[PDB]
């Protein structure tokens with residue numbers, strides 16, 4: 001479990017992310033899609049996007065970057081008591097979207113890269129450590145729901 005001090009580091013940076021959810025959403029999805037091109041194939045709606053310039057220009061991409069960070073922030077702010085928030089998500093990502101756990105590991109690294117590039121002073125090594133723990137917690141709970149449904153992985 002994260003301590004109360006680790007939760008404070010997490011949410012302190014997250015309140016900065018919430019200053020500009022759309023720009024953060026953008027960076028994180030584009031980092032995901034460039035670093036791990038196989039992830040872009042899961043999105044029928046982004047499949048046509050072939051360059052970084054085209055991704056930066058898509059309003060739909062930026063809109064759905066807000067969708068992802070908003071659902072994430074709702075989870076983070078439950079400081080581990082996230083059962084009602086996480087359940088629906090795992091269900092649709094296991095059974096409808098078919099997203100393996102490993103991809104949730106990729107987007108975790110993209111989130112951490114982008115926080116570091118945008119918020120140095122609030123994202124030192126202690127906060128990086130705390131955010132990695134929170135992201136591991138979220139992955140571990142999702143993985144348990146996956147296993148139950150027959151998708152573990």
Ligand code: HEM
Nearest residue numbers: 039042043045067068071072088089092097099103104107
């Ligand atoms: C930090 C984790 C992520 C969160 C919080 C998250 C959240 C969301 C939300 C809230 C929706 C819409 C409602 C739903 O369908 O249940 C959604 C849709 C979707 N998510 Fe995610 N997601 C995340 C990670 C991923 C990743 C890593 C991928 C793919 C590599 C993925 C693929 C999808 C797809 C394919 C859809 C449907 C888009 C559409 O309707 O065209 N998700 N996700």
